[PDB]
Amino acid sequence: HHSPGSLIYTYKLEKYVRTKIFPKILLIPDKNRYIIKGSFRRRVPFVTDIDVVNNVYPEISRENIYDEIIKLVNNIQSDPNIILAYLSCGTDERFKISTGSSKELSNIQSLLPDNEKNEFQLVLNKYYNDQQKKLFFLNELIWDHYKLRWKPEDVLIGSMNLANNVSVNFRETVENNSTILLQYYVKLGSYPVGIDVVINYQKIDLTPAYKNAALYQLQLANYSREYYYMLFPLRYYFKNNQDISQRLENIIEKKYGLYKQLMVRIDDYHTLYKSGNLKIDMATNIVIGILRDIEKLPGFESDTIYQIKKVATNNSPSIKIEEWDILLKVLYQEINTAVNNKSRKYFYRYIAMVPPQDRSKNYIS
């Protein structure tokens, strides 16, 4: 005979967010007017974020979306327990890549600051031959220029400045669009957790948006040869096969789930930082939790871990937060590299079970 932590899914957690959090961050909190999507709907053990769609039409439409959003943002800014990092709505069509011709990309590059002009140039050279791969990493670089992203300050003010001294108006933007994305952060457990709320204030079908989001994730993973994330499209393809689905879900969410969570948590650090919602206490707690859970990655070694602990001795809060941010970017790629190496064997195991004619839509050779 013989005898805190990272956020884990419990039904208790879900009941809390639905009854205590959702009534504060949704426009129409009625359970029949919102749908939980993504990994939280699948109740994955290592909670990453929570993705929700609020279908508010017709009670909220283009007629009153502006007033409703202004009211929502004002309520959030008054709540010390809920953070609204960004509000995404609208596009800057000056940064739309349609043809991919040399002058189109030239005109776009001119609008950028010098440091972004260089990075733009590097992508052009590196992928001189692969047109599609060139255009993808170009869109990756000009992403935040093309897709308008608003701080609460920008929303309440009513406008914000874009590149080349062009101003954009918020009311004008939302009244000529159909959806708004709200990126929240809420205390869930021992650190802030992201909640993405999509407001759908037209009666439009979001199906082409989901299909497009799925295709984007496929390209992102494949073009970077991130074999772990390259498993995600396979989860779609085998959703009818019970045995393969269970194994893929286990590999992604259970076997390597903590790798994904740590990557999200590091990203959340960066997002909270650049959005201006990161104080030294919050940043320190996150780094502590990350250092703790890094030790739970079997066989993971990193020189960054020492550098991070070394910085913590400093007294200046701004220096620590900035240095941590730089170091965590490196740690992110180390975690990314580690999980992609471990997952390579599983990707090829299951892509080989895909009929040759269907490999093109699940894999970029």
Ligand X SMILES: Nc1nc2c(ncn2[C@@H]2O[C@H](COP(=O)(O)OP(=O)(O)OP(=O)(O)O)[C@@H](O)[C@H]2O)c(=O)[nH]1
325 binds ligand X (CB under 6 A): no
Q: Rounded to an integer, what distance in angstroms lies between the CA atom of residue 150 and that of residue 127?
A: 32
Token pair, residue 233, equals 């499209």
Decide: 272 and 192 in contact? Cβ < 8 Å. Answer: yes
Phi, psi of 353 (to 5 degrees): -90, -5
Binding ligand X by CB under 6 A: which of 249, 267, 322, 323? 267
DSSP state, residue 345? H
**Residue 273 contact partner, candidates Mg ion, Na ion, ligand X, none, CB within 5 to 8 A by sort of partner:** none
By CB neighbour count within 10 A (0-12 exposed, 13-18 middle, 19+ buried), where does 21 fall? buried
From the list ligand X, Mg ion, Na ion, none, pick the one residue 263 interacts with, judged by a Cβ distance below 5 to 8 Å according to partner type: ligand X
Give the residue, chosen from 14, 24, 36, 51, that forms a contact with Mg ion under the rule CB under 5 A.
51
Q: Which does 14 bind (CB under 5 to 8 A by kind): Mg ion, Na ion, ligand X, none?
A: none
Q: How far apart, in whole angstroms, are the C-alpha atoms of residue 312 and residue 315?
A: 8
Nearer to ligand X, 46 or 170 (CB): 46
Yes or no: say if 335 and 309 are a contact pair by the CB < 8 Å rule.
no
Has 92 been labeled as part of a binding site? no
Q: How many whole angstroms separate alpha carbon 272 and alpha carbon 83?
A: 9
The one-character DSSP state at 356 is G
CA distances from 73 to 58, 150, 212, 287 (A): 20, 11, 29, 29
Lookup: tokens for 214: 């799925």
State the minimum distance, in angstroms, from the CB of residue 171 to ligand X. 28
* Helix (H/G/I), strand (E/B), else coil: 202: coil
How many residues sit in the footprint of Mg ion (CB under 5 A)?
5
Q: Say if residue 217 carries a ligand binding annotation.
A: yes
Q: Who's near 332: CB < 8 A, 6+ residues apart?
A: 263, 266, 267
Compute the least distance from the CB of residue 156 to Na ion, in Å. 12
Return the one option of Mg ion, ligand X, Na ion, none that residue 324 interacts with (CB less than 5 to 8 A, by type). Answer: none
Comparison of 123 and 182: residue with beta carbon closer to Mg ion: 182
Q: Using CB under 6 A, which residues numbered 197 to 236 contact ligand X?
A: 217, 220-221, 226, 229
79 binds Na ion (CB under 5 A): yes
Contact status: 119 vs Mg ion (CB under 5 A): no
CB-nearer residue toward ligand X: 304 or 336: 336
**358 annotated binding-site participant:** no
- In eight-state DSSP terms, residue 10 is -
State the amino acid at position 112 in one-letter form.
L
Q: Give the residue, chosen from 5, 38, 276, 317, that forms a contact with Mg ion under the rule CB under 5 A.
A: 38
Task: Find out whether 196 is annotated in a ligand binding site.
Answer: yes
- Residue ranges in 335-364 that form contacts with ligand X under rule CB under 6 A: 336
Task: Please report whether residue 249 would count as binding ligand X according to CB under 6 A.
Answer: no
DSSP of 302-315, one letter per residue?
A: -SHHHHHHHHTT--
Q: Does 51 bind ligand X (CB under 6 A)?
A: yes
Q: Which residue has the tokens 């390579």?
A: 344
User: Kindly report the CA angle at 233 between 32 and 221, in degrees rounded to 5?
Assistant: 115
Nearer to ligand X, 69 or 264 (CB): 264
226 labelled as ligand-binding?
A: yes
Site for Mg ion in 177-216 (CB under 5 A): 196
Q: Look up residue 323 and give its DSSP letter.
A: H
Q: Shortest approach of Mg ion to residue 42 CB, angstroms?
A: 10
Confirm or deny that 79 is annotated as ligand binding.
no
Query: What are phi and psi for residue 296, nearest 5 degrees?
Result: -90, 0
Please say which residue, 44 or 123, places its beta carbon nearer to ligand X: 44
Q: Among 101, 347, 65, 108, which Cα is nearest to 226's? A: 347
Q: Which residues bind Na ion (CB under 5 A)?
A: 76, 79
Known binding positions: 39, 48-49, 51, 196, 217, 226, 229, 260, 332
Q: Which residues bind ligand X (CB under 6 A)?
A: 38-39, 44, 48-49, 51, 217, 220-221, 226, 229, 260, 263-264, 267, 336
Known binding positions for Mg(2+): 49, 51, 196
Q: Which residues bind Mg ion (CB under 5 A)?
A: 38-39, 49, 51, 196
Known binding positions for GTP: 39, 48, 217, 226, 229, 260, 332
